[PDB]
């Protein structure tokens, strides 16, 4: 029988809304906060020469200079880790991550940020299967642009198994970057962490887990764009 009531507030309370404003244009999406880090979408840095507007339940912090942000890239994935400034209020460290086991049930979890209140928001349940190496994974939970970086949570155990990343062009197939192996290890042992700063993607497309990814919808597997 489908699993009973599950509490997702612990997971959503850690969700942040990010907005990068460099050289004119701006990219904004979500990220999962963990300890001194925010886990988000490597494609947040389509440009990296401005300000980062973080928006947690603690309020709104702003990073005056993106280029100073210590960042650790996840190879072959549209994922990345950000070490927030030293004068930044940490996030707890209870979230549990793990790789997505074939055919399991997952739900997209968010938070309401238009204020008037703060709030969990859980989507409908959906099956999920890989796509090539296991980089991106397929799910059919409606997702809208700007919603990348949102956690996909295992209805089974409650772990986060990946962050929503891209969508095909008609918007009828959705893909999320999976958690990588030994990811948890990577979050506590400040050794496997390979920091750099000022990194950016300075291409308007890139190849990941088998598909071509455009930082935006235009005018092997199917094309996709990052949401």
UniProtKB/Swiss-Prot annotation:
It catalyses: Hydrolyzes glutaminyl bonds, and activity is further restricted by preferences for the amino acids in P6 - P1' that vary with the species of potyvirus, e.g. Glu-Xaa-Xaa-Tyr-Xaa-Gln-|-(Ser or Gly) for the enzyme from tobacco etch virus. The natural substrate is the viral polyprotein, but other proteins and oligopeptides containing the appropriate consensus sequence are also cleaved. Residues 1-215 form the Peptidase C4 domain. The active site is at 43 (for nuclear inclusion protein a activity), 78 (for nuclear inclusion protein a activity), 148 (for nuclear inclusion protein a activity). Has RNA-binding and proteolytic activities. Homodimer; disulfide-linked. This is Nuclear inclusion protein A. It comes from Tobacco etch virus. The chain holds residues 2041 to 2279 of 3054 of the full protein.
